[PDB]
Amino acid sequence: GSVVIVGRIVLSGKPA
Amino acid sequence: KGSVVIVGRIVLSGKPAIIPK
Amino acid sequence: QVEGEVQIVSTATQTFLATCINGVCWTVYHGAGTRTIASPKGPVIQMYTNVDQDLVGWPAPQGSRSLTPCTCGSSDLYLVTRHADVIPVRRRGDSRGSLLSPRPISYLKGSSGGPLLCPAGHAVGLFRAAVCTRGVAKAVDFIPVENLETTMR
């Protein structure tokens, strides 16, 4: 089995 | 003499967010 | 090209959180096991495994940035959920903190391996388990950060 990435979270809330 | 100029910003008011896809 | 400190991760069974601190992407053993983490060059093996402390760490992936360990020692903490909700939490002991506002346990599902940050937003610990009366999460258990620095050494 392999651990996979489904999303990320930016703490500062920096936009695109 | 020349004017002071804004060239960037720092934003504190941002709160944690899911980076959109 | 925005980079996140906190990754939302998944096995075939569970779905939980990881946190980059000091170049290493940590999470919980009870979620990760000894699994590798995926990369587009193929699997990458755990750099640290510490079955005692429920603690696993890989090399931080692409599109990530690390936190710095909290150095102000404040007792006012903030848990970050996997829905990017922020929960104020008051530090009891080394690894205990109590929610200034207790809430439904469903509100923290999928969030173990999430971080706990001080006022400065620096890293205080990873979140492990919920202290709770029936229905309602009331305090939290967390891996403290010094555990990470001394797993690193």
Place this chain on the structure above:
Amino acid sequence: APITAYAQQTRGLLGCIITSLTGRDKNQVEGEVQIVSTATQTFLATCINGVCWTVYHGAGTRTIASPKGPVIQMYTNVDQDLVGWPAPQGSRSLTPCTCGSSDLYLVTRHADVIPVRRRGDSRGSLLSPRPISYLKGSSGGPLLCPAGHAVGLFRAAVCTRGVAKAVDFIPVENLETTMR
């Protein structure tokens, strides 16, 4: 709280000069801290209570480039090393700290939040020292209380051999004094 910050460049070296000279600036403004440049140097400017403050030793007596051309300072206090313009349309002001806490947090031109322990009116120490060069260009940035309220603006670094271990700053009080 938690205090977290990010940084956005909005202008290039070329566009900065042209805008300096014309004094006319049509870029939209956001956030509480502005990154600002003269021709010589670059530093920080913090909005508190509808006024955009920064260090005098940075701005001297200059206007600020605005959507309507150059804007004169509202306040000038050479001795505080302090200067003020009306906050740019679209910025957000910080509010002065009133918890009177002694655990401060300094915001950096690189959008870092570094913890400071207060050791007097206008002096506090870094919990972990830094190269003095790390702080160059952060003059005029805010120190915050744990609540995210303004306690002071960063003025100068206390150092030896190029390692800063404490910071010297203009306390929020001095602002109020300067308004009166």
